[PDB]
């Protein structure tokens, strides 16, 4: 890994760390998951944090988050991870991410995105010309640089 990737993950981290205190609490993780359409319980949230809570302080700090994201998985594992991520963006589950779905998820997470911005994103990613983003098209954007 390198600086650019670290800075990128730090921004990803900020989507969870709503108060900017440098740690992700179960409440913050819950807020993000609920914005994605999930409904995790307190127990489930504590278990998730416990998976990477090396210092036992009950929260995920950036070093812990970075370690989680830097971990290299097998191709098979990576493929299933990407598919799971795709399903989160593909709100209606029709196998395609629309501009409406993409903007909604991104905005709910904490990202600022205009219609023209999302239009451009979909356009660039749309390889087959159907106006939407399917799984493999999604993989290309995720792996791009």
């Amino acid at each position: 890994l390198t600086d650019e990737q670290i800075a990128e993950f730090k921004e990803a981290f900020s989507l969870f760390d709503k108060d900017g205190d440098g740690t992700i609490t179960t409440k913050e993780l819950g807020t993000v998951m609920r914005s994605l359409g999930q409904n995790p319980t307190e127990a489930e949230l504590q278990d998730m944090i416990n998976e990477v809570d090396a210092d036992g302080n009950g929260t995920i700090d950036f070093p812990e988050f970075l370690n989680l994201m830097a971990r290299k998985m097998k191709d098979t594992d990576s493929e299933e991870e990407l598919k799971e991520a795709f399903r989160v963006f593909d709100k209606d589950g029709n196998g395609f991410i629309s501009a409406a779905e993409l903007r909604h998820v991104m905005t709910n997470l904490g990202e600022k995105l205009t219609d023209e911005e999302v239009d451009e994103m979909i356009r660039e990613a749309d390889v087959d010309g159907d106006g939407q983003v399917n799984y493999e098209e999604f993989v290309q954007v995720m792996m791009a640089k």
Binding site: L36, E51, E84, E111
Partner: peptide, 19 residues
Amino acid sequence: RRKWQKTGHAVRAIGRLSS
């Protein structure tokens, strides 16, 4: 700048933790 990828990282993070 790389907004989509950034959100992608966050989504994948939740996946990793759920696994």
